[PDB]
Design a protein around this ligand. Structure first.
Ligand SMILES: CC/C(=C(\c1ccc(O)cc1)c1ccc(OCCN(C)C)cc1)c1ccccc1
Length: 207
């Protein structure tokens, strides 16, 4: 499926977190490290969104609305995929892998354990890189914003990406004719973790 190939080649290069080595470890350092990593990931996510077919043909407002509603889900799906080959550890970056102790010290134990629940499920499903890049595009298109202008166009985008997933799964996993549906059913947990994380992100006043 062409869309998948396209998403695969438009996939952004790895970003380093570069935690400040002179700063003592604390919950503030973790939050600062993560706060700066996401900022840079966000800039790249925008450049990546423009590669999704049909996306840059939406109005500017509609483009913002989607990103503004899906940014956290996308950042979270990334750390999750980077962590599939690990155990009880989240790889925010190659130079910033958080274990349970660091999560506790960061006051993110509950949140990270929820991100680990997502990872646990995808490991079980043997989530391929192709499904990762597509699910990420879908999460953006299906972000459920309230301020979309052209609802038809956004639903259109949703459909072309959904079709790519369905098509990919139809040819790569003939052994499971319901894989695509299983993949779509992992989205609720993603939405759930994302909204809870966004909540925390505001309680902390990050901005
Ligand atoms: C779960 C870690 C995280 C962020 C994160 C998620 C995925 C990823 O790849 C990198 C970081 C996080 C932290 C800050 C943030 O704000 C950006 C806006 N400001 C900093 C300009 C977004 C996500 C976070 C979110 C809310 C509170 C505390 C931590």
């Amino acid at each position: 499926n062409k869309i998948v190939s396209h998403l695969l080649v438009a996939e952004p290069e790895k970003i380093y977190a570069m935690p400040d080595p002179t700063v003592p470890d604390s919950d503030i350092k973790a939050l600062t490290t993560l706060c700066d990593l996401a900022d840079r990931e966000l800039v790249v996510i925008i450049g990546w969104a423009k590669h999704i077919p049909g996306f840059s043909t939406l109005s500017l407002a509609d483009q913002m609305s989607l990103l503004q509603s899906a940014w956290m889900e996308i950042l979270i799906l990334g750390v999750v995929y980077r962590s599939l080959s690990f155990e009880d550890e989240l790889v925010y970056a190659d130079d910033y892998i958080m274990d349970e102790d660091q999560s506790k010290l960061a006051g993110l134990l509950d949140l990270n354990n929820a991100i680990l629940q997502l990872v646990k499920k995808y490991k079980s499903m043997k989530l391929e890189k192709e499904e990762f890049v597509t699910l990420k595009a879908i999460a953006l298109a299906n972000s459920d914003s309230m301020h979309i202008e052209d609802v038809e166009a956004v639903q259109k985008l949703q459909d072309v990406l959904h079709e790519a997933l369905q098509d990919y799964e139809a040819g790569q996993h003939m052994e499971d004719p319901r894989r695509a549906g299983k993949m779509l059913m992992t989205l609720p947990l993603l939405r759930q973790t994302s909204t809870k994380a966004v909540q925390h992100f505001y309680n902390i006043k990050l901005e």
